[PDB]
Amino acid sequence: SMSYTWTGALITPCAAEESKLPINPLSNSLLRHHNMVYATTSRSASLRQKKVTFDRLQVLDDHYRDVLKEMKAKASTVKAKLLSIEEACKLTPPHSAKSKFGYGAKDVRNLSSRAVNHIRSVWEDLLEDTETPIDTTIMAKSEVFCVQPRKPARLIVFPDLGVRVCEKMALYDVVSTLPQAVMGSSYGFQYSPKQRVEFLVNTWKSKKCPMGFSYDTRCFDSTVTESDIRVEESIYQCCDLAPEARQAIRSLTERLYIGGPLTNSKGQNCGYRRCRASGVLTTSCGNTLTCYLKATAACRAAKLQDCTMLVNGDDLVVICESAGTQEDAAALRAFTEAMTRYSAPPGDPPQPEYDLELITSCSSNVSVAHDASGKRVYYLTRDPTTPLARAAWETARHTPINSWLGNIIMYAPTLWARMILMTHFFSILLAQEQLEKALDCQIYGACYSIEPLDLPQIIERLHGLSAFTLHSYSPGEINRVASCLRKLGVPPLRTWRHRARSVRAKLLSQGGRAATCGRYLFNWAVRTKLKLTPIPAASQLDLSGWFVAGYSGGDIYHS
Numbered sequence: 318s319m320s321y322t323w324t325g326a327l328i329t330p331c332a333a334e335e336s337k338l339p340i341n342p343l344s345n346s347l348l349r350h351h352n353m354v355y356a357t358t359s360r361s362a363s364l365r366q367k368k369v370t371f372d373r374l375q376v377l378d379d380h381y382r383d384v385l386k387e388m389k390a391k392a393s394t395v396k397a398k399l400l401s402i403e404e405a406c407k408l409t410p411p412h413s414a415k416s417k418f419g420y421g422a423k424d425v426r427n428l429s430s431r432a433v434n435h436i437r438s439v440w441e442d443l444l445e446d447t448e449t450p451i452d453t454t455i456m457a458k459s460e461v462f463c464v465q466p467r468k469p470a471r472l473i474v475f476p477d478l479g480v481r482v483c484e485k486m487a488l489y490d491v492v493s494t495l496p497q498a499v500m501g502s503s504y505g506f507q508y509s510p511k512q513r514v515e516f517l518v519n520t521w522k523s524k525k526c527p528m529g530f531s532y533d534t535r536c537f538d539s540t541v542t543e544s545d546i547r548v549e550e551s552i553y554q555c556c557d558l559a560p561e562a563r564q565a566i567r568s569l570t571e572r573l574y575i576g577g578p579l580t581n582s583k584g585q586n587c588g589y590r591r592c593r594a595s596g597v598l599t600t601s602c603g604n605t606l607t608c609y610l611k612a613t614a615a616c617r618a619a620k621l622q623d624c625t626m627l628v629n630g631d632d633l634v635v636i637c638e639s640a641g642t643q644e645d646a647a648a649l650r651a652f653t654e655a656m657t658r659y660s661a662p663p664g665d666p667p668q669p670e671y672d673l674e675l676i677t678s679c680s681s682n683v684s685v686a687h688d689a690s691g692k693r694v695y696y697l698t699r700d701p702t703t704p705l706a707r708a709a710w711e712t713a714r715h716t717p718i719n720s721w722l723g724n725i726i727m728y729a730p731t732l733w734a735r736m737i738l739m740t741h742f743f744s745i746l747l748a749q750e751q752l753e754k755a756l757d758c759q760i761y762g763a764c765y766s767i768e769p770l771d772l773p774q775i776i777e778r779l780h781g782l783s784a785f786t787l788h789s790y791s792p793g794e795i796n797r798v799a800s801c802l803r804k805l806g807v808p809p810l811r812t813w814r815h816r817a818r819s820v821r822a823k824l825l826s827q828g829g830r831a832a833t834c835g836r837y838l839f840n841w842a843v844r845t846k847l848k849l850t851p852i853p854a855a856s857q858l859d860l861s862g863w864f865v866a867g868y869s870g871g872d873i874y875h876s
């Protein structure tokens with residue numbers, strides 16, 4: 318059926334939308350071509366709607382059913398707990414959209430009488446009503462990019478805060494444990510960026526003659542069918558669940574996940590949805606399962622040999638045994654046809670890759686540099702354009718989420734993050750005197766509050782001490798960065814080194830943790846290096862919960 322139906326009423330903004338980069342003094346030292354940086358607005362909502370609206374086509378076969386059964390089996394071992402209203406409330410971010418029933422985030426987190434009473438009635442209701450389509454709000458997402466040689470805004474659909482908390486109660490544990498129990502080493506969110514690289518590299522080497530590819534499904538969420546969503550629930554239903562939760566899952570499936578009415582910021586009727594909503598708890602888990610499910614079966618239909626999957630929401634990368642160039646290309650083409658029948662048509666057609674570094678999955682790619690010792694070391698990098706366009710924007714305006722702090726944690730090893738992000742942001746903090754101030758940032762969707770002064774410990778635990786000494790990056794990685802800095806108008810190496818060296822001295826003089834950030838973060842800047850020994854604090858970090866599951870659009874905060 319139609320992924321969407323439109324009444325005519327427009328997708329409205331809930332306040333003035335900023336589309337241009339504010340000519341600012343701190344933004345300019347970072348990037349000069351400020352006219353190349355823009356933020357999507359509801360003004361392009363009509364373009365997106367036209368792209369994500371279509372009639373889906375789905376034909377299921379034996380391979381599909383076979384993989385589903387296999388998945389159902391591993392799911393069968395799972396035992397979901399069910400969170401109490403309190404637990405689910407602690408998971409609610411402080412900046413989470415308030416409810417239309419008289420309360421907001423704060424209240425929820427504070428367990429106020431009015432917050433809990435309503436949330437309880439919404440749950441009681443989920444247990445009693447198994448049919449009434451739950452109302453959702455559709456808004457145009459505001460994201461930052463760099464004009465290309467512009468993207469329409471993304472459309473987000475989320476339910477009320479009351480409903481969001483009940484989802485946590487009945488499905489948090491499910492979406493946190495089932496993917497791994499079901500997909501194994503294929504579930505990409507269980508890995509830290511260093512662990513993701515390792516998995517890719519080890520998998521690449523386990524092949525006599527490796528052949529890999531990334532698969533980009535054209536607007537994946539709209540391709541998800543009502544059938545896919547019930548198949549997804551049937552996987553959840555294999556779990557040992559409390560009666561209240563099993564019913565809650567049954568009700569949420571029919572009343573929210575499979576579809577529902579759409580309302581704009583103005584309380585107007587926008588239309589209907591019959592595909593995946595981006596703003597619910599099961600979106601990441603559901604997408605990962607569905608992509609994995611169809612892909613695994615697509616591989617068997619196409620005769621691809623010994624496939625290894627790595628799934629992250631709707632992002633997928635496969636690595637298998639080559640059967641030669643012709644054969645690989647035909648096999649790949651047969652794969653896309655199987656996927657197209659399973660209702661997951663490609664956006665960018667897929668191309669076979671015989672070199673690990675040229676494979677972009679999760680917007681990233683594996684690459685290689687060298688540690689002080691001269692030894693090779695693989696790390697995860699990515700074109701810096703978007704992270705840089707966003708660093709500029711987050712430097713000019715106050716934003717709930719600091720993508721830059723995220724990008725620095727996830728890409729600490731990369732040449733661009735060490736030379737640009739760390740230098741630009743550490744110098745700024747010093748000036749405003751806020752090196753202590755904790756900042757929120759997201760990792761695989763989950764919200765986290767992080768103290769800038771802890772970056773060193775964080776980086777060593779996640780990437781190893783090498784992230785402080787990598788040098789001699791690849792000629793491929795160097796070009797990409799260079800040609801990007803030119804595009805955006807970012808100062809050259811010399812300028813950043815000079816800036817870094819000053820940021821460093823200023824830090825070292827302060828001593829304490831600041832002295833530590835200086836010593837390790839900017840050791841690449843000075844000639845007279847400093848033996849970088851293991852940071853004590855790092856052996857006392859619990860970064861476990863950081864890499865367990867995906868939560869994008871799931872309204873998750875990890876206090």
Ligand SMILES: Cc1ccc(S(=O)(=O)Nc2cc(Oc3ccccc3)ccc2C(=O)O)cc1
Pocket residue numbers: 731732733735736787788789790791795798799802810841
């Ligand atoms: C974090 C970082 C680490 C080492 C260095 S370096 O000055 O020791 N060497 C390099 C300096 C570069 O300068 C740039 C050239 C073009 C675009 C951006 C940077 C590029 C690559 C390397 C290297 O080690 O291979 C600079 C920044």
